[PDB]
Design an enzyme around this catalytic site. Structure first.
Site, mmCIF file in Angstrom:
data_model
loop_
_atom_site.group_PDB
_atom_site.id
_atom_site.type_symbol
_atom_site.label_atom_id
_atom_site.label_comp_id
_atom_site.label_asym_id
_atom_site.label_seq_id
_atom_site.Cartn_x
_atom_site.Cartn_y
_atom_site.Cartn_z
ATOM 1 N N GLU A 112 60.009 35.321 25.784
ATOM 2 C CA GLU A 112 59.345 35.387 27.075
ATOM 3 C C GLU A 112 58.064 36.214 26.970
ATOM 4 O OE1 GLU A 112 61.679 36.973 30.344
ATOM 5 O OE2 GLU A 112 59.953 36.865 31.692
ATOM 6 N N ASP A 171 63.316 38.604 29.025
ATOM 7 C CA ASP A 171 63.618 39.816 29.773
ATOM 8 C C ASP A 171 65.076 39.762 30.228
ATOM 9 O OD1 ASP A 171 61.027 40.707 29.552
ATOM 10 O OD2 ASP A 171 60.514 40.513 31.671
ATOM 11 N N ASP A 173 66.504 40.145 32.942
ATOM 12 C CA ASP A 173 66.424 40.110 34.392
ATOM 13 C C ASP A 173 66.550 38.680 34.899
ATOM 14 O OD1 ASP A 173 63.893 38.873 34.048
ATOM 15 O OD2 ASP A 173 62.832 40.769 34.331
ATOM 16 N N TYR A 233 37.115 42.326 44.199
ATOM 17 C CA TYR A 233 35.850 42.394 44.922
ATOM 18 C C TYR A 233 36.023 42.164 46.428
ATOM 19 C CZ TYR A 233 33.865 42.141 40.233
ATOM 20 O OH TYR A 233 33.561 42.372 38.901
HETATM 21 MG MG LIG Z 1 60.788 40.145 33.827
#
Ligand SMILES: [Mg+2]
Ligand SMILES: O=C1c2c(O)ccc(O)c2C(=O)c2c(NCCNCCO)ccc(NCCNCCO)c21
Ligand SMILES: O=C1c2c(O)ccc(O)c2C(=O)c2c(NCCNCCO)ccc(NCCNCCO)c21
Ligand SMILES: [Mg+2]
Ligand SMILES: [Mg+2]
Ligand SMILES: [Mg+2]
Ligand SMILES: [Mg+2]
Ligand SMILES: [Mg+2]
Lengths: 663, 666
Positions: free
Chosen positions: A26, A106, A108, A306
């Site tokens: 990932e 990850d 998660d 900006y």
């Molecule tokens: Mg993640």
DNA sequence: AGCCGAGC
DNA sequence: TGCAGCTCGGCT
DNA sequence: AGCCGAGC
DNA sequence: TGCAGCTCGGCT
């Protein structure tokens, strides 16, 4: 050969092919950590290749999309895979450059989703490979982190299909319903090989659920968690001048423990500030700079680096500071962050609509008119029933008419000027000016391969916030267009169907609302009871503040009359003295304490100035003023308090919208 | 002609046709400018005006390589859109017939970097098609405001004029690699004249000499470090922000940059600032000897020269504990802080306790001049400062890089040989354990070892046993080839020896004048005199302030004692009477306030005290404080500026020992 | 077929 | 999330 | 034929 | 400085 970011295995493609593992990571950072913990020794049997971003769900993707996807193609080439080739025998596996794929994401929920999408990809094209055990994962003792996916029967086929097939939406609804009911149950009570069925039903479903929690707004305040954190951060900063959107985003990340890429936040901040036709009826944040226009649907916003923003003056009128004392503020690792929801004075969920796509469900609500909603809230405070409400977009000059239940015709404006000329002065809501021009007027002017020309010319006289097309046609064609229906011929009527009003209720439960009136009633009951809590809270707090001032006024007078002296007394003598004379320990501190040694600092921290004439007078006046303030508040009902808030809001709403028509 | 594959071009409707020469191609600085131009042109403008955005500085085509020129996207795009051809003279009216546009209007920011882009564009045309300049090919253009600017366009439109060979010489002065010396003189005169003053058509010569020169000068002002603190303004603003912020926990680098932008009026893109922050934080061999900011996260390694740093949204930093020991807070009171539009920002320089310009080896590239200084040892420098404080002569100094295991030998003034480490293990084997400073591990592998292994091959194999911060190659070869290598010299053959030459130590002195320093000893001495002088000022300042603090506390203690004794009362007294009474009894108006101003009577410092002040413990505590302040001022009066400097140096060295020890453990 | 937006 | 090139001077 | 870094 | 594509569900 010739693929960027691939660190191909040395033995990949040779005799030891089926002993080689491709590590799909990932993002590049995970690729780097894999590369560090791999080589030099591990360079022979282990290749590494980073994937950036969610990959294509191939299961029902179009042929063009599949053939053009960079990521899927790179994996196919690197591994040696071939479409339509079964891998049933042990001699067909000889064509592969790698024998195993190890997925490294990850730890998660979004990680689980990528795992799932990679699994879905292999299962769809080469299920045979899943039976040999082709896929592993690296969880983040290097062999104790390696976990093997294992196919173990048709219930594994069913689980992958349930998760990734467009034909299983209904099943996912049931799926997540079971999950949500179960976790609700456990909330009242307590709390090497991996089948695909266990991955889907015990890991992926955590993503699918989080997808809903982050994408589908709450009924109470109309926010999703990311939006809510943005408002929380803003309320806390209390910026009196503009802030760079990018800087504000970093500040939200810091103050609200937002654990995601910040470009998403910046896009969310921009969405909360937009004020063109078809975006926000009431933008809680000010679009200071180019935040997008109705010319391109906001896609013409400048870089978050900006453009600037700050709270609208309407924000704290809608979400009063005092109500913060009644919210449940969440925690992220012993840092207090945003509340589970705010409790605005009108149902913000209806004012600005609601767009969200999750898993199993999606949410769509159109805008409603802020003044209508205020009026219906006032009606309900009077015990009457609320009037039915039609969708209403600020500054939209067209019509929205009910067709049936939760279905509407939205029409722009076209008027015949003369026998050669029509004029278009409004496009239906969410029809953007550049898009209408390119997809309707141009084809009408030029014809296509499949349609004839219908008009002879058109001229544009738009402003940044309005639409004006002047269109020329022959008399013949105009006559035909009128007979057919001008709005119909010019694509100035769209329908708006709202059969997916899905929100989280105040308890945190996902619910489908059939009418907007139901949303309004559930919000009303909750908000009314929060004005009850606010009153109780104010009575107590003002009361403690009154007791506080009384003790302070009493000490000053006793001091300037010589009834009491502190000069050169020890701390302990002083504290015992004040107790013995019936001085109360800090009432305000005491009261906050109850809401979950004697403290006389609120007295003795007073300056020496306190003892002087003007300051004695000024202190007496304050004491008396707070006493009257306590009684003025006791005289007000929850309804009264709510009515004051509504009046203050409308006054400022008028000032602000009037100034927009000038500015 | 039409133009097929140039996505961001808006071609003029009539470009490439009969009315070609009456068309203008507007070249803009960035996409934002293009959009404003497109809005300004409305629908009318689409006919005679084309717009094309350039992103970033463009190639200086004069003296550029052929390859560079052929492969460059921007100039090839400009060539395609206009229909220009190399080597064609556009003298007569026949030659002009092969062009899709008659003129180019340049639209940049009205700032120095805009002027640079104009000049580079001008340089591009002047070098390939001087004939076009004679015809007036080039022009320039000086929100919702956008549609208004263009209806009044003619006032905003300036034409460049070619007026003689002085126009050729001005463009050549600015952009030719052969004119570095002339640029030095050009800027020297400019800087001199500027120093004194403190006491419709536009020829190219005037553009170069009156507009571009302002960029060239700004380029030096931002690229060339101060001698005093070794900072350039971007770095200085970062530090200033960090001090103001005083972060006790890590901040994301991208957030810090935004904060610097806000607090220090940094008027540039933030990516440059995040890179400066990363640069100030690095601590691999060959970067900083003392990193003022902490690299919390992946800030890059010696494996790739820091180019492997993670993105600034995924890395964190904060002040090093050494930063305020090197730049003591008290000295802030002696600095000249700058103003950017009513806002007070970073100082013109900080005044560190040792010459930081030598420690982390300042380096930059400007116009006319550049700066390179190698790193020096912090302790050696502290020691030379101590020596000079005692009237001794400073020892000469060799460049020294923290954690470098190799050798730096002096060949002569500002000339060094830097060597890695190579040793014969057996008759088939050498081991390389250090690379010369600023040779990166991956680069050495690719450009040295890889060739030796391959294409007349010299080695037979090599293996790697590096760590994030150390280098180890083991190299296999035949006895015959090793014997040869060892004969020719192992450091030579394996390219583990580089030279380091420092003949361009250009810095702004304390008065803001650019100067060339011949030796580090000169730099050190000039720093030394300034810093010693500033320990003088600090002492004066501290005696004044601590004195005012002493007086302040004297009056406060006095009021308290008088109050607890009956000698004075304030109870139910008017404010007016109370002021008048305090005056009559000779209490002093806020001594600290009065002192600060010196660079009606105010008794708030007495009367804002808490009622707690009158209590036993607070009375004794106040008397203690008063006495201690009196001792503090007396103790400071006795000391010399050298004494104070020595105290700071000792504090710094003690923390430097702790910090560096903890690094070698961690 | 492609929008809507909060994630990667 | 990571991808893309140039200036300017000294030096190799 | 390219590094160094503060700019676009 | 701007460049690059995918998910998930409802609905046009
Ligand atoms: Mg993640
Ligand atoms: O991968 C990201 C990405 C990411 O991994 C994490 C955070 C991000 O913001 C992105 C990302 O923005 C991104 C692309 N952005 C193009 C603009 N579209 C809207 C972005 O919010 C455009 C392309 C893109 N990735 C290309 C890979 N496409 C996946 C299809 O198999 C990304
Ligand atoms: O134009 C920028 C740019 C900018 O205009 C303003 C701020 C920027 O940070 C950039 C920019 O980074 C940039 C490119 N960055 C590539 C990363 N390497 C350099 C470190 O910033 C890589 C390329 C790039 N421009 C395209 C190539 N133009 C050079 C003309 O030959 C730029
Ligand atoms: Mg909205
Ligand atoms: Mg600029
Ligand atoms: Mg450095
Ligand atoms: Mg060069
Ligand atoms: Mg779809």
């Amino acid at each position: 050969k010739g693929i960027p970011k691939l660190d191909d295995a040395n033995d990949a493609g040779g005799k030891h092919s089926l002993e080689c593992t491709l590590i799909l990571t990932e993002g590049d950072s995970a690729k780097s950590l894999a590369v560090s913990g791999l080589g030099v020794i591990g360079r022979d049997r282990y290749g590494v290749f980073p994937l950036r971003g969610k990959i294509l769900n191939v299961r029902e993707a179009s042929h063009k999309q599949i053939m053009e996807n960079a990521e899927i193609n790179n994996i196919i080439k690197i591994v040696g895979l071939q479409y339509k080739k079964s891998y049933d025998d042990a001699e067909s596996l000889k064509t592969l450059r790698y024998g195993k794929i190890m997925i490294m994401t990850d730890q998660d929920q979004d990680g689980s989703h990528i795992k799932g999408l990679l699994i879905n990809f292999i299962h769809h094209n080469w299920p045979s490979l899943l039976k040999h055990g082709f896929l592993e994962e690296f969880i983040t003792d290097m062999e104790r982190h390696r976990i093997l996916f294992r196919y173990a029967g048709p219930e594994d086929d069913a689980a992958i299909t349930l998760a990734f097939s467009k034909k299983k939406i209904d099943d996912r609804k049931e799926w997540l319903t079971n999950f949500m009911e179960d976790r609700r149950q456990r909330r009242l009570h307590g709390l090497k090989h991996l089948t695909y069925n266990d991955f889907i039903n015990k890991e992926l479903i955590l993503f699918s659920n989080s997808d809903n929690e982050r994408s589908i707004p709450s009924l109470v305040d109309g926010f999703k968690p990311g939006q809510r954190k943005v408002l929380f951060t803003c309320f806390k900063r209390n910026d009196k001048r503009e802030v760079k959107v990018a800087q504000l985003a970093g500040s939200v990340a810091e103050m609200s423990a937002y654990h995601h890429g910040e470009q998403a936040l910046m896009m969310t901040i921009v969405n909360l500030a937009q004020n063109f036709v078809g975006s926000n009826n009431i933008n809680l944040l000010q679009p200071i700079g180019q935040f997008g226009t109705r010319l391109h649907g906001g896609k013409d916003a400048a870089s978050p680096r900006y453009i600037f923003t700050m709270l609208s003056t309407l924000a704290r009128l809608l979400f009063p500071a005092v109500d913060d004392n009644l919210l449940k503020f969440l925690y992220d690792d012993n840092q207090r962050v945003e509340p589970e929801w705010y409790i605005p004075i009108i149902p913000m969920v209806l004012i600005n609509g609601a767009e969200g796509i999750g898993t199993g469900w999606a949410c769509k609500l159109p805008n409603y008119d802020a003044r209508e909603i205020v009026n219906n809230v006032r009606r309900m405070l009077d015990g009457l029933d609320p009037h039915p409400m039609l969708p209403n977009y600020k500054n939209f000059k067209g019509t929205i008419q009910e067709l049936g239940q939760n279905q509407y015709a939205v029409s722009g404006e076209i008027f015949v000027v003369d026998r050669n000329t029509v004029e278009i002065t409004e496009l239906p809501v969410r029809t953007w000016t550049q898009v209408y021009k390119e997809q309707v007027l141009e084809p009408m002017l030029n014809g296509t391969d499949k349609t004839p020309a219908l008009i002879s010319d058109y001229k544009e006289y738009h402003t940044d916030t309005t639409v004006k097309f002047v269109v020329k046609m022959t008399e013949e064609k105009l006559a035909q267009a009128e007979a057919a229906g001008l709005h119909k011929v010019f694509k100035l009527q769209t329908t708006l169907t709202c059969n997916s009003m899905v929100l989280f209720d105040h308890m945190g439960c996902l619910k489908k609302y059939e009418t907007v009136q139901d949303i309004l009633k559930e919000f009303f009951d909750l908000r009314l009871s929060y004005y009850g809590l606010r009153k109780e809270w104010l009575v107590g707090m003002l009361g403690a503040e009154s007791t506080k001032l009384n003790n302070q006024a009493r000490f000053i007078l006793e001091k300037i009359q010589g009834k009491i002296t502190i000069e050169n007394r020890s701390k302990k003598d002083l504290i015992q003295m004040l107790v013995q004379r019936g001085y109360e320990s800090d009432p305000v501190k005491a009261w906050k304490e109850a809401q979950e040694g004697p403290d006389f600092n609120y007295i003795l921290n007073m300056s020496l100035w306190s003892l002087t004439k003007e300051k004695v007078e000024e202190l007496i006046k304050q004491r008396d003023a707070k006493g009257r303030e306590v009684n003025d508040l006791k005289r007000k009902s929850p309804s009264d308090l709510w009515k004051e808030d509504l009046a203050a809001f409308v006054e400022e709403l008028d000032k602000v919208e009037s100034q927009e028509r000038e500015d």
